[PDB]
Amino acid sequence: IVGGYTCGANTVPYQVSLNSGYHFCGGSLINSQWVVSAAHCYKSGIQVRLGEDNINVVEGNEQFISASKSIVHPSYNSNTLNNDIMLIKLKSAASLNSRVASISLPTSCASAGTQCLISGWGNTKSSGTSYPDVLKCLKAPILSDSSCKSAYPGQITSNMFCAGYLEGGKDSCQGDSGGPVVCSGKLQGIVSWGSGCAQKNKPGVYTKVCNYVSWIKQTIASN
Ligand SMILES: *[B@]([O])(O[C][C][C][O])[C]([C][C][C][C][N+])[N]C(=O)[C]([N]C(=O)[C]([C])[N]C(=O)OC([C])([C])[C])[C]([C])[C]
Ligand SMILES: [Ca+2]
Numbered sequence: 001i002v003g004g005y006t007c008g009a010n011t012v013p014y015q016v017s018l019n020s021g022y023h024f025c026g027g028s029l030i031n032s033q034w035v036v037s038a039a040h041c042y043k044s045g046i047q048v049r050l051g052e053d054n055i056n057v058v059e060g061n062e063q064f065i066s067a068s069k070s071i072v073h074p075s076y077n078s079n080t081l082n083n084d085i086m087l088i089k090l091k092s093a094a095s096l097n098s099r100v101a102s103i104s105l106p107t108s109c110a111s112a113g114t115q116c117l118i119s120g121w122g123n124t125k126s127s128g129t130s131y132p133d134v135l136k137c138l139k140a141p142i143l144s145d146s147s148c149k150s151a152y153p154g155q156i157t158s159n160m161f162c163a164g165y166l167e168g169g170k171d172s173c174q175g176d177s178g179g180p181v182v183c184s185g186k187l188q189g190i191v192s193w194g195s196g197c198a199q200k201n202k203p204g205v206y207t208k209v210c211n212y213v214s215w216i217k218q219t220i221a222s223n
Helices: 145-151 209-222
Strands: 015-019 023-031 034-037 047-050 063-072 086-090 115-120 136-141 160-163 180-183 186-193 204-208
Touching (some): 023 047, 023 180, 086 209, 115 186, 145 160
Antiparallel strands (some): 015 023, 015 047, 023 034, 063 086, 115 180, 160 204, 180 186, 186 204
């Protein structure tokens, strides 16, 4: 997260770290056995690390659970990043409490100007790399579809939205992928792509989760 603030340990209890010997992507727990992340985070040998704050120190409250199957959306297109979403099923259910809790799926899409929280362990620097140890947080508004499309002409599908700041300086960045965008207590976005990090007129683009709620529900119910 570039331009953000330290969240405070376990203040974002639905955030997960997907790990394969290092943190590579964020994720959201949406019930005791299922995590939602981004399809471009897919790989095998994924360990879901729940209840984390410093990802480099075991501090208490951590639950490390192997991913039993990852389910990339069938229409995921890796050249457009359209339908960038994947569900990870956990090998055993997590124990839920105040430091590890699931976030709700939206019942409607959020309007332009809704203030949301984006969080993750990715790069904090726009020019160069600085990985944080602890979870970083950013409050950022959803941008109107016109300013999003004026920034990325031709690249925005209806499954995507921009959030952030046109003046630059604050944004998600590399290592934040797969992580949550929560607006009024509902998971509305998944961190996906952008042109670099926190550059002027280039906001982050996020998978629009309200379009996928029946898919999530139906895929979880059949698996
Ligand atoms: B994401 O993948 O983090 C995990 C990467 C390391 O394991 C990251 C989120 C970036 C959000 C920026 N607001 N997403 C990506 O890196 C995706 N690629 C891009 O955003 C790239 C750098 N830019 C891009 O595709 O657009 C142009 C610059 C216009 C070419 C990618 C990995 C899906
Ligand atoms: Ca830790």
